[PDB]
Structure formats: structure tokens, C-alpha cells
Design a protein around this nucleic acid. Sequence first.
RNA 1: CUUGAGUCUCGUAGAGGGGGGUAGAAUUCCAGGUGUAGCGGUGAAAUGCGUAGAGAUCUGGAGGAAUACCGGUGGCGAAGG
RNA 2: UAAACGAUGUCGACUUGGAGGUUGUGCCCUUGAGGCGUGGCUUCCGGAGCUAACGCGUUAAGUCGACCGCCUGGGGAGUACGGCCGCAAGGUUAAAACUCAAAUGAAUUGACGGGGGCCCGCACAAGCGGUGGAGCAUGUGGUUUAAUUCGAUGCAACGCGAAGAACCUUACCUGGUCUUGACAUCCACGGAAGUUUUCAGAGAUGAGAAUGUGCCUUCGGGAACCGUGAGACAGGUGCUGCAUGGCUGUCGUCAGCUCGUGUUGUGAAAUGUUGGGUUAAGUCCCGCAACGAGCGCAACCCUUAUCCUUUGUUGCCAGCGGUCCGGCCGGGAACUCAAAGGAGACUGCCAGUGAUAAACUGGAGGAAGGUGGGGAUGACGUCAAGUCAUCAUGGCCCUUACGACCAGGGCUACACACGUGCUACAAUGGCGCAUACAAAGAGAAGCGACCUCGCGAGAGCAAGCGGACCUCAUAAAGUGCGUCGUAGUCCGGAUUGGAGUCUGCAACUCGACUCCAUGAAGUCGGAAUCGCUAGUAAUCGUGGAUCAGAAUGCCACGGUGAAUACGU
Lengths: 150, 105, 206
Amino acid sequence: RRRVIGQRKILPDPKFGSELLAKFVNILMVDGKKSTAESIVYSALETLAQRSGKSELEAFEVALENVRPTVEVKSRRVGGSTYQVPVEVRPVRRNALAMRWIVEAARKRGDKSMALRLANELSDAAENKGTAVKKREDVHRMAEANKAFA
Amino acid sequence: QDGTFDKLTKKEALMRTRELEKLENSLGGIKDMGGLPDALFVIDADHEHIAIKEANNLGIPVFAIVDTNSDPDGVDFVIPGNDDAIRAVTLYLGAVAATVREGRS
Amino acid sequence: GQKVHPNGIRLGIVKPWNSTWFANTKEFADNLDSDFKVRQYLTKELAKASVSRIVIERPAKSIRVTIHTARPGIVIGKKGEDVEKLRKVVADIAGVPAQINIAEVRKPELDAKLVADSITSQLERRVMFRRAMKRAVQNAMRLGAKGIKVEVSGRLGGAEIARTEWYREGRVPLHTLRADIDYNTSEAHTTYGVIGVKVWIFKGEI
RNA sequence: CUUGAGUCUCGUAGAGGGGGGUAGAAUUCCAGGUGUAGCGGUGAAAUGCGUAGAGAUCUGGAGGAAUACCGGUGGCGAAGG
RNA sequence: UAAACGAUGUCGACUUGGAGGUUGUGCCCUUGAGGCGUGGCUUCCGGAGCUAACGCGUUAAGUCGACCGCCUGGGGAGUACGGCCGCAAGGUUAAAACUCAAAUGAAUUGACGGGGGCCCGCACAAGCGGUGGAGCAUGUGGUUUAAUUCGAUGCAACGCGAAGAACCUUACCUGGUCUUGACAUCCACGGAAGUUUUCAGAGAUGAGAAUGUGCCUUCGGGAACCGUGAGACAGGUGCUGCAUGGCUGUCGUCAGCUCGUGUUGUGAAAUGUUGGGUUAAGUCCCGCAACGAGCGCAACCCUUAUCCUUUGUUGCCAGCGGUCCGGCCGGGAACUCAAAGGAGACUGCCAGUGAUAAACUGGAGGAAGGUGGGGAUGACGUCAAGUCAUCAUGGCCCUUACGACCAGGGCUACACACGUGCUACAAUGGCGCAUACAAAGAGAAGCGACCUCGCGAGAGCAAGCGGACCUCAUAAAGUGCGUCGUAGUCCGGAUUGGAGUCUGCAACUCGACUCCAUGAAGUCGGAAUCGCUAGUAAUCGUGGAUCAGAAUGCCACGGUGAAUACGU
């Protein structure tokens, strides 16, 4: 509320030396599994280079521009009455929700193993598909059309 | 001073020192004698109408220097002076000091 | 119940003890049981001693239990009999050739147990609960104890009303760790239920 | 006698009254044109109005009633006003 | 006729001030707008004064005077009757009977709102993880039963009491048995007893028999026990927290409680304790009629975040002898680790926002920046809260007994619902292979080293230790190796019966454990709902206590490790 907290300071990628990639493994952690994620997501990310066939240090974002969010519903029951009131995305969520848009359909897809199942969906965004993509298709509908109540 | 010496703690006693030094900063004038002063020489009326309101309720001679904004019904030896113009009040208090420093004759 | 006992939570300070000694696992338990046998049969049999505390120290197979008592002349017994006979009592009720010790209590107004003994001694005296209650309060104040809030247990009067007696006097900073409050209670088996008393003597600091 | 009360000279303000006209917006109604399936109504609804031409639009015409803005803790009157 | 109301009759005189408004006017350079004055009408503050009070306060509800109208408890009643008036509706004038002891007005402290604004908190928000889906373990509600004992069972129960239920346990039902017991003190009797055998009984007990027979014994016969009889008996988880103590939960680690003194008020009372920010706060400062004090928050405790004083045995092995290569012995205790004492973070400082203040912020220092991190500490109060089934505890009980001994069963039975947890539903997983991976603890009636087999259970052997010396006990997920590529699946484990291991006499009901077959539902769970703030969630395991034994419960320790928190 009235008080605020700063963003927790994060060391960079232990392998590529980039803090943005280090934050990425931190969201997929269920059951406390980064060492398994070492054989799951780190084994996934290592394969993401040659499958993409280019340097995944700064070309890593060539599939993320469409994913850029602009609005989400903020529940302001102002005066005791819930409203739509979609506030524009501030930087502490517009990038967090980008990672929240990744593995929603990548647990039990019925494939070899999610050691490389996630290594299927990533190039799909710069191959024009995958989970992160259609996330922005539904956001445009809830805003920009209800001006009488938005 | 004695408590910080050896009694219980060093740092907590130092905190109490640095705080209650503000308490002793308050009450700086009255601090010597047993109280109940003979008379009173307030330098205004409105700003401290409570002061006169207590000294007359107790019967102490208020030697005020009334402003002209003020309410001189309560005072004892009203002085139609001007309370602002710090030069003036310095002059008044200098005269009063000259009187009181040897009022013992 | 939200009123933890202040003495034990302050036992980490000069707060005294009543059974401090050493043992291995093969003989904690029996020695603890031996300590209760001497702990109970030295209180029921010693109602009039006005005992403040009995403290158990066990140096080596021959222990040095001391007893905190009010009147030095009354605890002697018939000139040393209780010194020997109760040592005879403990020589087998504890299983060691023990040695008894007796400690005086100077100004028994300063002991929360002994005062609570004093009021309890006069609670059954068939007196009214207010006048006698406040009368003792200043007695300690004239003799020190710079703060005590006085409590009497429930069941006051002939009615279902069983209330408390808060009655603070002075300074009893319970939540303040540096408080070393002197606390012990006392209760009286009344012809109607249970009537007790709780008193918190404040013995300065350190 | 002139200070109380009143007459005269002189101006100042005012939704102070009474009688006359007079303007425009606004509701309503009527006539005309265009063209059309809904109109209205409320917390959802029917009664209602309507396919004939309603609502909507502009063109006019009749009538009656009140005077937006200024407008105000403003003003006037013995009060009602 | 009107709430026709300023609920204030008209008229006159006197009595501090301020700010407006509207309308005249005099003087002044009106230069002008106006400045200096003077009139009238007018709205709002306010001490005197008045008022019960609110309030009025030069437009009085002030201080006086002249006249007029009205009042005399509430109801009945502005009603009946009569009159006058009115077309009529009805107005005005205007009682009484009877009934009650109040009806009122100002205001104070509670305050309930379908006043209001504010501000707080995984309250909501944003995510995570969940429960509810399945299947298993316990508990609650019901059914049955002999009992399936009792309590709690709105927030605050339902993996609770009850820290571990085969008999025992267990307070329940049945059956057998004794009735001064089976609990304990006091009597009579004699003598020790204890123990070893019987017989029956399920034991209870009953019939016993003996070995016996210790010591005081101014030698009873006691100290003792043995065994029986009368009594004061005890005794009973037998009734009352709605009699209690104590204890516990509840708002709630809530900041709110207050009190003295002082002041204000005729007083109920207020003040402080409110307001301006500020914060975890009744926090700080600013002012404030509050000034102090007390209970509260806070720290004073412990642990943890650095280094230092004092110290190295088993433990660390810096360095020296070799390595008895593991640091083994010496040996250093440099030093990991360890402990008897400390210091270090204290708004401390730069700078700023900010009233300068407080507060806050940017920055710096140092391991540690604004209670560093956690616990201990629950104010007044609060609820017939619950507890007489823990105990103690008034009153109510019966004492050959609603006392008891012993033996079966039952607390786990089912027809279902619910509470809680765990297990999954897999390939973030499984298999086996190689691999390094901790900490805290526990214990000579013990773990049990080691040694052999058991596919294992554990068993036969067994050191060691009184534990910086012995075991539990190796970590585990994990990574690389092939692996299936989602298979109701090598998932999962119910499940069943067989085979066996130990625990305890004896374990179907009601032991555990192992092996085998068992491969079910469930392939992520709707209505929904809850938990969640850094090492957090998420997890992974490890042990401990409780333990003859029988954890998904509970305590304790580590392993890995994110986002959400802008916001009232």
C-alpha cells in the first residue's frame, strides 16, 4: 500500500552472464528443481541456440516483441464497487507476465520430456507460434473497446 | 552520568543520554530553585495569555510588556510597549537586567 | 490464559533456584523423584514455618538442601530435632546421607510467598476482602518493594460472582525484562470452593 | 420652546403594487415533405404508441402556461409575497 | 388557514470591536479604482453582559422605559357545547369529565446506519502453492453394535485433548470374582517374610502344601509383612467451569488503555489521548491546556550477521618428520569448528525532501541503514469460552456401593457426509550404473562396528563408548550413462492371498516389517475455496521425542531454491 519495496537485486546468468536469462529459470521453479531444471531448462536453453541457429545472447528477443503487454485488469473496487479500470502496465509486471506467459502449456504435452519440450515452443515464436504468442491476442479485446466503462 | 558508567549497559544508557538531553534542553531556566517565583516578567500577552491566566489565578505579579494586539485585562503592571522589533525587547530586558543585578542595594 | 509466570521467564537473571544439581541419564529420574519426596513432605509438615523456599543442591552423594524461612527461632524445632529428624526423613526418603540447611528471610514483608502466606493466613480468619486487602499494601511500601499490583483469586461473596482483584500499586513492568519482579501466589481451601491470592513484589533492580 | 412627530425644495435605488400590450425558447397538438420498424419504459415489464408512417428530422401553424442567462449570503414589501 | 417561523409584539434610549454586502452622499491629486468621512439597510465572527444550555451578542435573547397579546403538568383538546361567521367545507371563541406522575427542553458519555471521509492488515488486489477430483491414514457427525466411553464440535473443533489403543492400556459393554478391598491411615489376632511346588479356574481367585521364619523383642508382639473379622472407612474419569482455583483459547504483538495533577465547564464531563505532517505504534516532532506518571509498543533475553581477548582433545590439519596418505602420530593451535568475554549499526554521518522540526529520502561507510534477521515477552479488557476427564476444588451423590479384581471384546465396527494429512496421477519421472553432496540430535538395560545369510524383514558374531572418543547414518533430490516417450503406464500404490522376519506370553478383530502375486481408482480435480512475502513459496530428504511395539501425526535439522506487494 503506502509503503513500497524495491526490486530484489539479482546476479547475472551463471553461464551466459546475463541477468535477464537468470531470472527466467526462477519462475519455472515448482518443487524446487533448478538442478533438475539444469537437465530440464538449462538442457532446453542449450538446445535453443543451434535449433534457432544463431547467437542466443541478444538475438534471444527476436521472438518477444509481439508478446509485449499493454494492459491487465486491476481490481479497483473504488468506493466499494468493482470496476474494469485496466491500468497500463508498469515495468514490474509487464516483464514478469512475459515469463508468466511461457510454460502454461508445456508440462504434460505428451512428448519426450520437458527437458526438450520447452525447447520446442521457443523458436515457435520466431517461427510464429507457441504459448507466449497468443497471450497478446486476448489482451486487446478487454481494453480499447469499452471506452464507456474502461 | 553514573548509570552509563558501569550499571547495566553502555549503548542503551548512551541512547538515554542523547534523548533526555533534550528533556534537560527543555526546562532550561527554572531548573535551579524550588519553584514558586516571587514575580513574573513576561514579554507579551496574547502569545501566553495562559501564563498570565495562571499567575493571576495564583496571585503573582505579572510585569508584562503588552503588545497592542493583546488583552491587557489580565495583567498586573501592564506596559504599553511593542513586543516585536527584537531591538526593542533587547532594550527592555537590558534595562530590567540593569535594575535587577543590583536591586539588592 | 496470557499471563506467563514472570519469575521463570526471568530465571536467566539472578532469579534463584530450588533444585540445582547434576546427574546422568541412569539417575536423573529417581533423583528427581527423591527431590519431590523431600519437596512435598517438607511443606505439609511445615505449615507454620512460613517457608520462603527450599533449595536442593546435590554436591556428591551427600546433599546440602537449604530452607528459606521467616522466624529463625521457630524453625530450630525443639533445639535441633527438626535438623536431625528431617535429615532422618531425607536420609531414606531421598536415599542419600543428606545434610539439611536452613536460611532466614530478613524482612518477610519482602517475600511474595510469605506475604501471600500472611494474607492467606488471614483470609480464612473470616474477614472482609477490601479493608484487610489494602491495609497490607502500604506496609511493604513503608518497608520498600517499590511497586506491587495485588491480586486475589475468584469466588468473592455468597453469590455465583467469581471475579478478580487487579489493584495495581507502584511499578511492576512485566514486559520489561529488567524487572526482577518478586512473584509467588497463595491459595486457601475455603468452605466454598477455592480462594487464592497473587502478589508481585518489586525488589528494585540487579 | 425645539430635540419628539409631520409638510415642502431635491434627487437615489428597487422582482413594491395595479392595468395594458409584446418577444423568443420549451412541452403539446395540427398540417407538409423525406423516408423508416420500432418508439417509449424501468431494477427487468407489460399496459401504452405505432408498419396506416409512429419515433427521428427539418418546414410551418394553433394554444396555454411560465419567464433560461444576469441571479447574488442580491433587492423591494406590514406581512402573504 | 400555514412549520403564516427570525418558532424572537410594536416603540424609544444607552452599551467594546472586526470583516463583508447593497444603496445615497460630503471632503481629498476622487488623478482613479478610490483615500479620508458620513447616512441608511444588510450577512458573518466575537469578550463584556445575559441564558438551563445551546446560543444571542449595537438588527440583542445585553441595560432600562411605554403599551398590547399570550402561558401556567401531559393527555382529553384546540375537542364537546353555545354563539358569531362561512353557500358548503369549515374558522374563531372554548371548556369539563376521566387518566397518569410524569410529559418536556440543552447538552454529556455510550452509538447502531440501509451517515460520511480517512487510515491500517495474503483484507482486497497480482501471482504462487494448494484443498476440494482420485486413492489411502486419522478425527468429527450420523447408522449399527455391548460399548462403539467423555469433552470441543460458528469464526476460535473435526492427523483435538489423546506424546505413541494386542491383553493391559480404556474412564465402555459383556462375562466370572471379591465385597473395610483392589487405594491408603487407624483396631483385633498371632506369627516375619520372602520364596519353591501343586490343584482347579480364563484369570480373578479359591484349596493348598511346603522351603520358611531377618532384626528389636525391660520377649507383648510390634517395627514390618503375612492372612481373616467388626468399625472410623477409603474409594468411584460417579452430577454441576451455566460454584471454583489454576490453566488455557478469543479480539490480538491489538495499540490501545488509562491515572494523578492542572485547566475548562453550575455540572454530567472534557482535556490530555485532538489537530499537521510523520511512523510498527498513544511513533517523533509542531502547536495544542495540558504537564507528568503508570499499564501497553519499543529494548533490557536467546539465536543468528563481522572481527577481537582467552583455547585445542578426540576435532582443523596452515607449517615442520614421514606420511601409520585418511592429516596417522607427534606437533601449530595459524586456523576451519568450537566456547568464558566483548566490540561492531547506533539516523552513525554527506546531501536533500521536508516548518528548520519531526519525519522522510538520495548517497556514503563498514559483514551488517533505518526495530540488520528471527523467535521470548500478549495491556486494560474480552467471551456463564472450556476445563470438577489432569489436578485441586463448594455443593450433589453411594458406601457388602452408580466400590473394585480378573477374563473377552471396543474405542479402528458401517450406509454415508465432513475435518485434516499423505500418496500419486510421472518422463521436472522411473530403472540400475559412476558420482560428490548436511545439519541437529539420540543413546553401557543402547546403538550396535565388524564378520554370514536372508532379494529383504532380521537373524547368528560383535568392538566401542560413558560419549569434540561407538552406532544410528548413508544424505536425498542431483548430474552423466541406456531407457520408455506417455504408456490406468516400470506411474501409482490400494488390494488380496501366499511365503516368510522380528516385537512382544499371546498380536484376526487390534503388531510391525520383508519377499511374491496384486498394477485398481486417479493421467492434475469442477462449484469453488484457502495459504503464501526471502531463503518466501516451492520443495528434497535427514533424524528425534512420544516408542514392548505400530506415524501420512507432531518436534528438530539440514539440501536446493523465484515472482507477486503499484495500490486504499
